[PDB]
Amino acid sequence: YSTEVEAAVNRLVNLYLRASYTYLSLGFYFDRDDVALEGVCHFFRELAEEKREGAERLLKMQNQRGGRALFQDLQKPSQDEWGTTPDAMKAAIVLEKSLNQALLDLHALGSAQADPHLCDFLESHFLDEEVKLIKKMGDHLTNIQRLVGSQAGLGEYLFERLTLK
Amino acid sequence: YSTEVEAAVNRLVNLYLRASYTYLSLGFYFDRDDVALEGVCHFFRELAEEKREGAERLLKMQNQRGGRALFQDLQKPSQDEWGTTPDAMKAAIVLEKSLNQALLDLHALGSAQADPHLCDFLESHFLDEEVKLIKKMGDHLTNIQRLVGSQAGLGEYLFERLTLK
Amino acid sequence: YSTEVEAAVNRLVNLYLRASYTYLSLGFYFDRDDVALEGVCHFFRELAEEKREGAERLLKMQNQRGGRALFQDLQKPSQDEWGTTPDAMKAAIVLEKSLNQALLDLHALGSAQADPHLCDFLESHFLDEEVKLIKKMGDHLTNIQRLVGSQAGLGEYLFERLTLK
Amino acid sequence: YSTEVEAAVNRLVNLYLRASYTYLSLGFYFDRDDVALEGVCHFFRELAEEKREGAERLLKMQNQRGGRALFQDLQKPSQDEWGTTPDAMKAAIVLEKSLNQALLDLHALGSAQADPHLCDFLESHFLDEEVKLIKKMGDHLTNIQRLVGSQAGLGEYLFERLTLK
Amino acid sequence: YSTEVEAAVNRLVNLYLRASYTYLSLGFYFDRDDVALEGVCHFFRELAEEKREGAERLLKMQNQRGGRALFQDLQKPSQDEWGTTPDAMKAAIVLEKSLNQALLDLHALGSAQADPHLCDFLESHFLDEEVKLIKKMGDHLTNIQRLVGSQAGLGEYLFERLTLK
Amino acid sequence: YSTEVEAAVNRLVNLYLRASYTYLSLGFYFDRDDVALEGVCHFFRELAEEKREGAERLLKMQNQRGGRALFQDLQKPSQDEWGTTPDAMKAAIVLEKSLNQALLDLHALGSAQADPHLCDFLESHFLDEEVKLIKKMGDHLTNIQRLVGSQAGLGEYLFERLTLK
Amino acid sequence: YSTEVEAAVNRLVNLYLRASYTYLSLGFYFDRDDVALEGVCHFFRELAEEKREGAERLLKMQNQRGGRALFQDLQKPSQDEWGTTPDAMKAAIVLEKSLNQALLDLHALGSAQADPHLCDFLESHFLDEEVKLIKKMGDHLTNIQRLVGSQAGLGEYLFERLTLK
């Protein structure tokens, strides 16, 4: 278990916890009385849970391999307010694509260091999860954009009620 | 709902998330193969969940009152390694006493600003939880110290097996 | 399906059966009336079953790929008596680390020969099993050493009763 | 997600649908009143379903990755009549070995283009399925050949009744 | 508990494990795609389990009597390929008759050394098992020979399908 | 049914009842408020029941064979106080080894007088029971000695709590 | 946790135990054969239980806060005989009003010392209980007085039968 992979795993834990923090902020923004889109609030709060779970899986694996988990400061999310539903879904896609690239980079490192356990771990618990999530978010964005292109406020409500719940 | 309370609530959210992060680190330290005290790992990981839940309750209340949740960077835990079981339980007590003082300070602010909803919220969901937790930790510390004063390694194992599980 | 992989698979079957044989000997040593640690006996006898199952999985796969299973003499375990619980757990760790290296070597061979079925088979049924087992054994060794460092006989009994069962 | 992989996935979809079509023809040939081997009819019709399902899985994955599914003409099966049970089982083996080589070729392309999601997708849902199927068909062919070498008509009936059902 | 019986028990353990190994090889031979007689594969793999269980019973008894289990190298089976079903059943009968003679020899030794516990142990758990097994194998051989004398390939298939399952 | 066997059976009944009486005394010694090891009390009281049951089985058999049961005075146990747990377990082992030798002596007599019913009766209901019991007691003694060698009082308590119950 | 509150809590424990003692005496007075009002006996004996439970809650809280429970002599009840049902209900009201004032005094002390946990504890588990109990007793007294104003003996019986049970 290389020191390079150990360090990269610790960095990835930080990224997952940062993503979880971002989703917490996204969720509570949509919970504001002047935003008030409960389906959107719950969608992002569920994702905050999923990202924290990813971090925890990485930490468990780090220990299983004999690495040392090391934690760093968690930067606050990039925005304090998240705009409209399409703005937020776009931000979420950018976040997930960034996480996915970090997963692919760690996979490449594991491949270069001949670490098939790491490569399998990522494929089995992260890579497909990310692909499916990015696809779902893409589908959501297309639906939201189609709706708000017709009528902004109306479309946002309809999406929250009939897709997100 | 005063701007002073709003800001103090945001600070308290940060403190709860910092505490949760500290407990995550405590837990995964005890999960190391060269530490290997599963009851201790689970005790602290459960507390990480409890503190995150406290933060979420505070955020929900902030929105219910019409305040704006604002997130700040989360500082990393104060240690990378947490020593022996008594060392870790002492650190946890210091953390909880600090959180409890922050709760009491916010309560005093609510009292001074004639905010009975805030004062009730804290009493009902935080103050007694903290008192009970601090008492439990005190009981644990007394038991651990009594055990390791007799025989260090043996005592730690016995405590983990027979109290924490 | 290369002749190199076919031969390597046959060698790995031999290694798994040798490991199973070693665990049989470890188990029955702890079953002696002058050793008498039933939790340890059962721990190793369970591992003897697990290793034989690994061999059988390899043999089934060999046939699925159209290879020919070839069996060789099984060398007896390296010791007739296995010392104390920490001695035995150390021996078990050395055994598992050796098996794990053999798995990684076969994986490297499959990778070099562009055999993704072999590589997937090993990752899915062996690599993670080994990582988890080595971690469990590491945890056990740390606990045993902590216990016997305090009081040898007492510690061994406590570990057998309260961890292994 | 490379244009090379996208195109190769579309080609593989065509191959799976072609295989499904071939199995449809094999099945209905054995359903003829002058052939009349129901176990064989059902064996091949089940495989027609399995291959169509493989195509559908590939199409779902193509969309998940953001590729564009493109369909081409489906060539008719290579024969209109499929001979005896051993003739048909031989044809099926040639078909499956060809599909398996196409899977391995796509895997090699994914490997060269550093696409671990594709490589995992194929390993998890296709590669082992193919190995198991080819082994089953090999077993069937050996049994059929052993039977028809003794007595042709008799052997075919016995195989259909007692192996295929 | 005599040193002569102790040594003889250790030898018998080796013989049972050798027999188990032989049955493993017999089973996986019949699992080959170019042999493909599943009822035969399962018959021998079940016997591999039975012989290992006999070894384990002997080891448990050795410890109950205060003897020391000592393990020796396990010789590989006498063949790499096992021919036709009648060839394999003949080999199995020769193996069982050899094991049975070893049991009778140990019984004679126990009798000469006035060891009624050993004599009872063998009678109760081994002697009748062996007689019944040898009879079953004899019945199988008669049926197989009757079948292959009529038509070789056909007969082997019929026996595997209708007797062994 | 020989007069020699009849007399020997009556002697063996006396020995079993003497053993039962000894176990009654052992049990009630450990029930004293100044000894107070309930797991030990119950272990020996259970054995008192087992030995009385052995006597009753012998008496039933005596009558089945047409012998005349004749009872003699039952000597009191050899001690009034039984020391520590290891002292008592040693005494119990000496008792069981003595009973076992008496069983073997009666078996030898039955063998010399060509009494296969007696020999079977002893093997089936006594000989293996004794071997298993002596092994269990040996295991207990090893555990107790290992424990009290570390710390006397502590070890006795741990054994009673965690092994005997 | 102030020394003033600690002492006041200990005083309140004494008051609750004194009240429980008074209710024990009230109950057993109504159990006399020359008083014989079972509904009244049970009413007061239930209250004796309730007051002891209040004391126990206070003691648990004292320990949770890190205070030291200190016990003082318990003065006997103020009467040996309790007169008629209205006399006893009046005495009970005077007792409860006195306890309630003690609770309010402790609450005022907690308020002055900025102890929101104490204030919440009292409000949540004592203050409303007392208000409800005093109201119930007031209702009872009004009913009893209305009844005995009509006919003394008759009224007491009717109240005991139809209100208290």
Side-chain angles (χ1 to χ4, degrees):
Chain A
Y1 192 58
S2 67
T3 53
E4 290 89 4
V5 168
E6 179 186 50
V9 170
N10 280 328
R11 291 195 295 276
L12 191 60
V13 167
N14 189 270
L15 295 182
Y16 268 75
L17 295 172
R18 278 175 60 191
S20 179
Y21 201 15
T22 291
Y23 285 129
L24 182 67
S25 174
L26 274 156
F28 278 96
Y29 170 78
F30 286 95
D31 185 69
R32 287 173 49 180
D33 77 87
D34 63 1
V35 180
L37 293 165
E38 278 304 308
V40 188
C41 169
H42 286 255
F43 178 77
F44 289 130
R45 284 179 55 46
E46 288 157 25
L47 288 169
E49 178 167 81
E50 292 304 300
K51 298 303 161 184
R52 194 203 48 260
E53 287 165 0
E56 286 159 5
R57 203 177 298 263
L58 284 159
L59 291 161
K60 185 175 185 82
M61 179 278 289
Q62 178 82 285
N63 274 349
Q64 286 168 351
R65 292 300 302 277
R68 182 182 300 272
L70 286 177
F71 297 96
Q72 303 297 162
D73 300 325
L74 291 191
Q75 51 206 97
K76 73 173 190 190
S78 64
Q79 301 174 212
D80 296 322
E81 300 188 329
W82 298 99
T84 61
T85 302
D87 295 330
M89 199 64 62
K90 284 173 198 181
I93 288 165
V94 171
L95 180 54
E96 291 304 327
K97 286 184 175 191
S98 80
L99 275 184
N100 194 44
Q101 189 60 59
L103 289 166
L104 295 172
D105 290 349
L106 174 62
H107 189 284
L109 174 61
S111 189
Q113 296 247 13
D115 197 325
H117 185 270
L118 176 72
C119 290
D120 169 70
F121 169 84
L122 293 176
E123 286 161 18
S124 301
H125 305 292
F126 290 83
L127 293 195
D128 192 49
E129 171 170 277
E130 273 315 297
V131 161
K132 283 162 156 68
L133 182 55
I134 290 161
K135 174 65 165 62
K136 182 58 70 166
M137 285 182 174
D139 290 356
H140 287 345
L141 181 66
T142 290
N143 277 281
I144 299 156
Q145 289 175 325
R146 184 160 43 217
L147 281 159
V148 302
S150 272
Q151 221 120 44
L154 202 92
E156 280 198 276
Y157 179 75
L158 286 174
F159 185 73
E160 181 270 334
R161 289 284 94 186
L162 301 181
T163 292
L164 295 179
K165 109 141 181 63
Chain B
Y1 192 58
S2 67
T3 53
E4 290 89 4
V5 168
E6 179 186 50
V9 170
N10 280 328
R11 291 195 295 276
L12 191 60
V13 167
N14 189 270
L15 295 182
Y16 268 75
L17 295 172
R18 278 175 60 191
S20 179
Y21 201 15
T22 291
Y23 285 129
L24 182 67
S25 174
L26 274 156
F28 278 96
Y29 170 78
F30 286 95
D31 185 69
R32 287 173 49 180
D33 77 87
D34 63 1
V35 180
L37 293 165
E38 278 304 308
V40 188
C41 169
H42 286 255
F43 178 77
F44 289 130
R45 284 179 55 46
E46 288 157 25
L47 288 169
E49 178 167 81
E50 292 304 300
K51 298 303 161 184
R52 194 203 48 260
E53 287 165 0
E56 286 159 5
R57 203 177 298 263
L58 284 159
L59 291 161
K60 185 175 185 82
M61 179 278 289
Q62 178 82 285
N63 274 349
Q64 286 168 351
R65 292 300 302 277
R68 182 182 300 272
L70 286 177
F71 297 96
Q72 303 297 162
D73 300 325
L74 291 191
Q75 51 206 97
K76 73 173 190 190
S78 64
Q79 301 174 212
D80 296 322
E81 300 188 329
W82 298 99
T84 61
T85 302
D87 295 330
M89 199 64 62
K90 284 173 198 181
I93 288 165
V94 171
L95 180 54
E96 291 304 327
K97 286 184 175 191
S98 80
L99 275 184
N100 194 44
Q101 189 60 59
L103 289 166
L104 295 172
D105 290 349
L106 174 62
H107 189 284
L109 174 61
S111 189
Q113 296 247 13
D115 197 325
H117 185 270
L118 176 72
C119 290
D120 169 70
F121 169 84
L122 293 176
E123 286 161 18
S124 301
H125 305 292
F126 290 83
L127 293 195
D128 192 49
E129 171 170 277
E130 273 315 297
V131 161
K132 283 162 156 68
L133 182 55
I134 290 161
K135 174 65 165 62
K136 182 58 70 166
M137 285 182 174
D139 290 356
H140 287 345
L141 181 66
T142 290
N143 277 281
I144 299 156
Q145 289 175 325
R146 184 160 43 217
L147 281 159
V148 302
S150 272
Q151 221 120 44
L154 202 92
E156 280 198 276
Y157 179 75
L158 286 174
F159 185 73
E160 181 270 334
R161 289 284 94 186
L162 301 181
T163 292
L164 295 179
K165 109 141 181 63
Chain C
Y1 192 58
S2 67
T3 53
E4 290 89 4
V5 168
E6 179 186 50
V9 170
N10 280 328
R11 291 195 295 276
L12 191 60
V13 167
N14 189 270
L15 295 182
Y16 268 75
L17 295 172
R18 278 175 60 191
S20 179
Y21 201 15
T22 291
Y23 285 129
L24 182 67
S25 174
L26 274 156
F28 278 96
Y29 170 78
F30 286 95
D31 185 69
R32 287 173 49 180
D33 77 87
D34 63 1
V35 180
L37 293 165
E38 278 304 308
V40 188
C41 169
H42 286 255
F43 178 77
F44 289 130
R45 284 179 55 46
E46 288 157 25
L47 288 169
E49 178 167 81
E50 292 304 300
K51 298 303 161 184
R52 194 203 48 260
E53 287 165 0
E56 286 159 5
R57 203 177 298 263
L58 284 159
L59 291 161
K60 185 175 185 82
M61 179 278 289
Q62 178 82 285
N63 274 349
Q64 286 168 351
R65 292 300 302 277
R68 182 182 300 272
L70 286 177
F71 297 96
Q72 303 297 162
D73 300 325
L74 291 191
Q75 51 206 97
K76 73 173 190 190
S78 64
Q79 301 174 212
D80 296 322
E81 300 188 329
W82 298 99
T84 61
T85 302
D87 295 330
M89 199 64 62
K90 284 173 198 181
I93 288 165
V94 171
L95 180 54
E96 291 304 327
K97 286 184 175 191
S98 80
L99 275 184
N100 194 44
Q101 189 60 59
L103 289 166
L104 295 172
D105 290 349
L106 174 62
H107 189 284
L109 174 61
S111 189
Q113 296 247 13
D115 197 325
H117 185 270
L118 176 72
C119 290
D120 169 70
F121 169 84
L122 293 176
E123 286 161 18
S124 301
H125 305 292
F126 290 83
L127 293 195
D128 192 49
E129 171 170 277
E130 273 315 297
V131 161
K132 283 162 156 68
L133 182 55
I134 290 161
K135 174 65 165 62
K136 182 58 70 166
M137 285 182 174
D139 290 356
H140 287 345
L141 181 66
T142 290
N143 277 281
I144 299 156
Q145 289 175 325
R146 184 160 43 217
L147 281 159
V148 302
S150 272
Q151 221 120 44
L154 202 92
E156 280 198 276
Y157 179 75
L158 286 174
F159 185 73
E160 181 270 334
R161 289 284 94 186
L162 301 181
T163 292
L164 295 179
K165 109 141 181 63
Chain D
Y1 192 58
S2 67
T3 53
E4 290 89 4
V5 168
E6 179 186 50
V9 170
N10 280 328
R11 291 195 295 276
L12 191 60
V13 167
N14 189 270
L15 295 182
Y16 268 75
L17 295 172
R18 278 175 60 191
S20 179
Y21 201 15
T22 291
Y23 285 129
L24 182 67
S25 174
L26 274 156
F28 278 96
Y29 170 78
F30 286 95
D31 185 69
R32 287 173 49 180
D33 77 87
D34 63 1
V35 180
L37 293 165
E38 278 304 308
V40 188
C41 169
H42 286 255
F43 178 77
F44 289 130
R45 284 179 55 46
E46 288 157 25
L47 288 169
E49 178 167 81
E50 292 304 300
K51 298 303 161 184
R52 194 203 48 260
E53 287 165 0
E56 286 159 5
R57 203 177 298 263
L58 284 159
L59 291 161
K60 185 175 185 82
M61 179 278 289
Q62 178 82 285
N63 274 349
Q64 286 168 351
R65 292 300 302 277
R68 182 182 300 272
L70 286 177
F71 297 96
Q72 303 297 162
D73 300 325
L74 291 191
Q75 51 206 97
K76 73 173 190 190
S78 64
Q79 301 174 212
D80 296 322
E81 300 188 329
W82 298 99
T84 61
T85 302
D87 295 330
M89 199 64 62
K90 284 173 198 181
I93 288 165
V94 171
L95 180 54
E96 291 304 327
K97 286 184 175 191
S98 80
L99 275 184
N100 194 44
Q101 189 60 59
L103 289 166
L104 295 172
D105 290 349
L106 174 62
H107 189 284
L109 174 61
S111 189
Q113 296 247 13
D115 197 325
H117 185 270
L118 176 72
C119 290
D120 169 70
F121 169 84
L122 293 176
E123 286 161 18
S124 301
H125 305 292
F126 290 83
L127 293 195
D128 192 49
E129 171 170 277
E130 273 315 297
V131 161
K132 283 162 156 68
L133 182 55
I134 290 161
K135 174 65 165 62
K136 182 58 70 166
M137 285 182 174
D139 290 356
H140 287 345
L141 181 66
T142 290
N143 277 281
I144 299 156
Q145 289 175 325
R146 184 160 43 217
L147 281 159
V148 302
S150 272
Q151 221 120 44
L154 202 92
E156 280 198 276
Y157 179 75
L158 286 174
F159 185 73
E160 181 270 334
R161 289 284 94 186
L162 301 181
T163 292
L164 295 179
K165 109 141 181 63
Chain E
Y1 192 58
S2 67
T3 53
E4 290 89 4
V5 168
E6 179 186 50
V9 170
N10 280 328
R11 291 195 295 276
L12 191 60
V13 167
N14 189 270
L15 295 182
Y16 268 75
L17 295 172
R18 278 175 60 191
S20 179
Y21 201 15
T22 291
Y23 285 129
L24 182 67
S25 174
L26 274 156
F28 278 96
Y29 170 78
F30 286 95
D31 185 69
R32 287 173 49 180
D33 77 87
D34 63 1
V35 180
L37 293 165
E38 278 304 308
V40 188
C41 169
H42 286 255
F43 178 77
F44 289 130
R45 284 179 55 46
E46 288 157 25
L47 288 169
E49 178 167 81
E50 292 304 300
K51 298 304 161 184
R52 194 203 48 260
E53 287 165 0
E56 286 159 5
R57 203 177 298 263
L58 284 159
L59 291 161
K60 185 175 185 82
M61 179 278 289
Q62 178 82 285
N63 274 349
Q64 286 168 351
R65 292 300 302 277
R68 182 182 300 272
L70 286 177
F71 297 96
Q72 303 297 162
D73 300 325
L74 291 191
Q75 51 206 97
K76 73 173 190 190
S78 64
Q79 301 174 212
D80 296 322
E81 300 188 329
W82 298 99
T84 61
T85 302
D87 295 330
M89 199 64 62
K90 284 173 198 181
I93 288 165
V94 171
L95 180 54
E96 291 304 327
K97 286 184 175 191
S98 80
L99 275 184
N100 194 44
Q101 189 60 59
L103 289 166
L104 295 172
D105 290 349
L106 174 62
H107 189 284
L109 174 61
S111 189
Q113 296 247 13
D115 197 325
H117 185 270
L118 176 72
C119 290
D120 169 70
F121 169 84
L122 293 176
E123 286 161 18
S124 301
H125 305 292
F126 290 83
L127 293 195
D128 192 49
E129 171 170 277
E130 273 315 297
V131 161
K132 283 162 156 68
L133 182 55
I134 290 161
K135 174 65 165 62
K136 182 58 70 166
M137 285 182 174
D139 290 356
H140 287 345
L141 181 66
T142 290
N143 277 281
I144 299 156
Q145 289 175 325
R146 184 160 43 217
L147 281 159
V148 302
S150 272
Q151 221 120 44
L154 202 92
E156 280 198 276
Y157 179 75
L158 286 174
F159 185 73
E160 181 270 334
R161 289 284 94 186
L162 301 181
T163 292
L164 295 179
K165 109 141 181 63
Chain F
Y1 192 58
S2 67
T3 53
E4 290 89 4
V5 168
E6 179 186 50
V9 170
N10 280 328
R11 291 195 295 276
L12 191 60
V13 167
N14 189 270
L15 295 182
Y16 268 75
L17 295 172
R18 278 175 60 191
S20 179
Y21 201 15
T22 291
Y23 285 129
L24 182 67
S25 174
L26 274 156
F28 278 96
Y29 170 78
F30 286 95
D31 185 69
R32 287 173 49 180
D33 77 87
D34 63 1
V35 180
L37 293 165
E38 278 304 308
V40 188
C41 169
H42 286 255
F43 178 77
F44 289 130
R45 284 179 55 46
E46 288 157 25
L47 288 169
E49 178 167 81
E50 292 304 300
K51 298 303 161 184
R52 194 203 48 260
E53 287 165 0
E56 286 159 5
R57 203 177 298 263
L58 284 159
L59 291 161
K60 185 175 185 82
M61 179 278 289
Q62 178 82 285
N63 274 349
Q64 286 168 351
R65 292 300 302 277
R68 182 182 300 272
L70 286 177
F71 297 96
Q72 303 297 162
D73 300 325
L74 291 191
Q75 51 206 97
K76 73 173 190 190
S78 64
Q79 301 174 212
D80 296 322
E81 300 188 329
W82 298 99
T84 61
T85 302
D87 295 330
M89 199 64 62
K90 284 173 198 181
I93 288 165
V94 171
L95 180 54
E96 291 304 327
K97 286 184 175 191
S98 80
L99 275 184
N100 194 44
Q101 189 60 59
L103 289 166
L104 295 172
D105 290 349
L106 174 62
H107 189 284
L109 174 61
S111 189
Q113 296 247 13
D115 197 325
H117 185 270
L118 176 72
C119 290
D120 169 70
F121 169 84
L122 293 176
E123 286 161 18
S124 301
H125 305 292
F126 290 83
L127 293 195
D128 192 49
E129 171 170 277
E130 273 315 297
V131 161
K132 283 162 156 68
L133 182 55
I134 290 161
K135 174 65 165 62
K136 182 58 70 166
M137 285 182 174
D139 290 356
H140 287 345
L141 181 66
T142 290
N143 277 281
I144 299 156
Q145 289 175 325
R146 184 160 43 217
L147 281 159
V148 302
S150 272
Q151 221 120 44
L154 202 92
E156 280 198 276
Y157 179 75
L158 286 174
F159 185 73
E160 181 270 334
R161 289 284 94 186
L162 301 181
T163 292
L164 295 179
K165 109 141 181 63
Chain G
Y1 192 58
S2 67
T3 53
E4 290 89 4
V5 168
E6 179 186 50
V9 170
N10 280 328
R11 291 195 295 276
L12 191 60
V13 167
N14 189 270
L15 295 182
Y16 268 75
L17 295 172
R18 278 175 60 191
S20 179
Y21 201 15
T22 291
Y23 285 129
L24 182 67
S25 174
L26 274 156
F28 278 96
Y29 170 78
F30 286 95
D31 185 69
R32 287 173 49 180
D33 77 87
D34 63 1
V35 180
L37 293 165
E38 278 304 308
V40 188
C41 169
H42 286 255
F43 178 77
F44 289 130
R45 284 179 55 46
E46 288 157 25
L47 288 169
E49 178 167 81
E50 292 304 300
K51 298 303 161 184
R52 194 203 48 260
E53 287 165 0
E56 286 159 5
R57 203 177 298 263
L58 284 159
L59 291 161
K60 185 175 185 82
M61 179 278 289
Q62 178 82 285
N63 274 349
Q64 286 168 351
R65 292 300 302 277
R68 182 182 300 272
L70 286 177
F71 297 96
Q72 303 297 162
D73 300 325
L74 291 191
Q75 51 206 97
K76 73 173 190 190
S78 64
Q79 301 174 212
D80 296 322
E81 300 188 329
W82 298 99
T84 61
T85 302
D87 295 330
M89 199 64 62
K90 284 173 198 181
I93 288 165
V94 171
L95 180 54
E96 291 304 327
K97 286 184 175 191
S98 80
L99 275 184
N100 194 44
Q101 189 60 59
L103 289 166
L104 295 172
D105 290 349
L106 174 62
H107 189 284
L109 174 61
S111 189
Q113 296 247 13
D115 197 325
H117 185 270
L118 176 72
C119 290
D120 169 70
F121 169 84
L122 293 176
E123 286 161 18
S124 301
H125 305 292
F126 290 83
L127 293 195
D128 192 49
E129 171 170 277
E130 273 315 297
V131 161
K132 283 162 156 68
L133 182 55
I134 290 161
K135 174 65 165 62
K136 182 58 70 166
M137 285 182 174
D139 290 356
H140 287 345
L141 181 66
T142 290
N143 277 281
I144 299 156
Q145 289 175 325
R146 184 160 43 217
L147 281 159
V148 302
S150 272
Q151 221 120 44
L154 202 92
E156 280 198 276
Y157 179 75
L158 286 174
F159 185 73
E160 181 270 334
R161 289 284 94 186
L162 301 181
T163 292
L164 295 179
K165 109 141 181 63

